[PDB]
Design a protein around this ligand. Structure first.
Ligand SMILES: CC(=O)[C@](C)(O)C(=O)O
Ligand SMILES: [Cl-]
Ligand SMILES: [Cl-]
Length: 314
């Protein structure tokens, strides 16, 4: 066995995502008697911050293991766009119906065939839109807004349909762009908004539209996986499962509850948080429906249809 294994993370331990990675690494070390020793590489440094080619680096073996967002791997694995379909998932029960059901199983099978062994699910969360200029209640309010997105083309199309001017860039590159005003806004889970203190870089309006949510996946490179004994593979897998459950709890703190206290915490920092009426929500869904239909065909219409059904029956 290697003396040190490398785990890639976009977000470090200040964030639930990175805490999940840390827990995984600590449990693996503990339960292998110190035999498997994993170092965390936050900021996606193993790919020079270019998170949208992290999957290829994992498949190639530049990265040994990772906790990744489905968004970042979507350019290489089209099925991961399922979680990015605008207004697919109404709530946490809907996301869980996917990850814990046939849809998640189908996605895992696809990943395994691609040379990247999936072991567990975590969560980034529902990605709420923020900006420095004005309240967003309806699609028209986004007209001309310079919103940062990750470099996965579906996000460009979604925001184009809403009349915005989206620009793609890595999480690293988003920071100076928000600080200078080069972009007006961004979209990310509450726990990321909070831990990155995005209100300090102009993000003073938030709308909790819940348009998409990105889960996380715990994965190991196939050859690293096979290099381990079947018994060690079992330890690492169970450690990922344990870490994933803990990490989802961290990612949902103050959020999967009626009065979303976590967003009230942000109000206290001078953030105007807007909650849409059901009618306002339906207008956003209708405005993005053509993008949804287009990408449903691209992803695999049968897989998306299975997701729709799992959500309806949740
Ligand atoms: C998808 C992801 O990696 C982040 C940190 O949420 C982002 O880049 O916005
Ligand atoms: Cl950090
Ligand atoms: Cl829920």
């Amino acid at each position: 066995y290697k003396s040190e294994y490398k785990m890639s993370l976009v977000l470090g331990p200040a964030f639930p995502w990175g805490k999940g990675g840390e827990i995984w690494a600590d449990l693996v070390k503990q339960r292998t008697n110190g035999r498997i020793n994993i170092k965390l590489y936050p900021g996606t440094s193993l790919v020079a911050g270019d998170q949208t080619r992290e999957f290829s680096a994992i498949r190639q073996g530049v990265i040994d293991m990772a906790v990744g967002s489905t968004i970042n791997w979507s350019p290489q694995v089209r099925e991961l766009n399922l979680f990015s379909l605008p207004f697919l998932m109404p709530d946490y029960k809907a996301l869980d119906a996917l990850t814990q059901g046939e849809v998640g199983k189908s996605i895992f099978a696809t990943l395994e065939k691609a040379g990247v062994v999936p072991l567990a699910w975590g969560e980034n969360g529902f990605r709420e839109v923020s900006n420095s200029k004005r309240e967003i209640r309806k699609p028209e309010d986004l007209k001309g807004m310079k919103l940062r997105v990750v470099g996965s083309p579906l996000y460009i199309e979604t925001f184009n349909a809403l009349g915005a001017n989206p620009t793609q860039m890595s999480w690293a590159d988003a920071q100076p762009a928000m600080a200078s005003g080069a972009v007006d806004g961004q979209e990310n889970p509450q726990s990321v908004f909070a831990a990155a203190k995005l209100y300090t870089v102009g993000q003073k309006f938030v709308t909790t539209w819940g348009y998409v949510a990105d889960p996380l996946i715990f994965v190991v490179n196939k050859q690293i996986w096979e290099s381990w004994t079947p018994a060690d593979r079992e330890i690492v897998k169970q450690a990922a499962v344990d870490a994933g459950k803990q990490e989802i709890a961290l990612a949902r703190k103050g959020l999967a509850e009626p009065g979303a206290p976590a967003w009230k915490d942000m109000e206290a920092h001078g953030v105007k948080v807007t909650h849409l009426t059901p009618a306002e929500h339906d207008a956003f869904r209708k405005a993005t429906a053509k993008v949804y239909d287009k990408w449903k065909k691209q992803i695999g219409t049968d897989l998306v249809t299975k997701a729709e059904g799992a959500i309806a029956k949740r």
